[PDB]
Design goal:
Chain lengths: ~50, ~50
């Protein structure tokens, strides 16, 4: 079946892309904010979290 | 010089005041301790003011 399969595959792949979006640096020096929080002082940390 | 396989101890590093510059880059001196690094290096040279 074609019509019943795309409506599930597109949603699953969009959810996979949403999950993968957390693995990107987004122009920063790290992906997870906890590394900056445990490594940087709060004035420099808040810029990376922003 | 390469330093490894030991308890890093910087309490005497920040509790002293004989140094003139103690601004760290990227890592912060407040969060410098309690962080487990794989290897730590130390270079040394004499330069002008």
């Amino acid at each position: 079946l074609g019509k019943l399969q795309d409506v599930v595959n597109q949603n699953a792949q969009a959810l996979n892309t949403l999950v993968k979006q957390l693995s990107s640096n987004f122009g920063a020096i790290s992906s997870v904010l906890n590394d900056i929080l445990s490594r940087l002082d709060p004035p420099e940390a808040e810029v990376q979290i922003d | 010089k390469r330093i490894s396989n030991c308890v890093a101890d910087y309490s005497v590093l920040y509790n002293s005041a004989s140094f003139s510059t103690f601004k760290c880059y990227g890592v912060s001196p407040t969060k410098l301790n309690d962080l487990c690094f794989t290897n730590v290096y130390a270079d040394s040279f004499v330069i002008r003011g």
